[PDB]
Each structure stands twice: as C-alpha cells, then as structure tokens.
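Lab notebook, bench 4. Still working through the backlog of constructs that have no structural model yet. Next entry is a single chain of 109 residues. Request: give me the structure tokens for it.
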Amino acid sequence: RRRLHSEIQSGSLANNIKKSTVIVKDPTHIAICLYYKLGETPLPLVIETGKDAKALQIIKLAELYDIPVIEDIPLARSLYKNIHKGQYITEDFFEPVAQLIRIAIDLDY
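Model written out:
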C-alpha cells in the first residue's frame, strides 16, 4: 500500500539530512544543508534549505542524525539567497565553505 503524503515528505526530508555533510544555520531560522562526496561532487552542493518552521525541522533532524551544525549568520543568508537546491556553490563561497567544512569534519587532506 502507498504511504501517506506526509510520510513520503518527512521520509524524503530525513534522508537528505542524514546524508548531509554539514548544516549552516542562522538563529532567525534559516538552515542550509550542504552535500559533498569526494569523487562524485566536484564541489559542495546545496541539498536542502529551510526557513522558519522548516529550518527548525532541519535542525532537529540534524541533532537526531548527529550531522554537524555551524551557526554562521552571513554565510547562511548568502547561501540561501544565492545557491539554490541542486546547485553547486560558486567561487565566492569556496573559501568560506572550505573553512566551514574544516570546523565540522576532520579531514584528512
């Protein structure tokens, strides 16, 4: 039998958070989920975003799945405005996102 629309939506959101590399948040309720996989993605990409209730939801799922969350107001707002879901970060973001990822994760290289 088919699952409820709400279950497909919640399940879909959960899976995208679970596979996120790092989430960048603003306390006014923006959350940006970055995805990077060495050899697959040439650059980090924005996999999910949210504002207000959706931001709160993303942040709570992040806590559930132990995904690193960094507060960075200017970077959250700028990514929100500029890098839409499915898009790679652009050059102005390379250094700030690199630094973000190094806060969140121990590479390696």
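Notes after review: The chain is about 45% helix and 20% strand. Strands lie at 22-26, 30-35, 45-51, 69-71. Flag for follow-up if needed.
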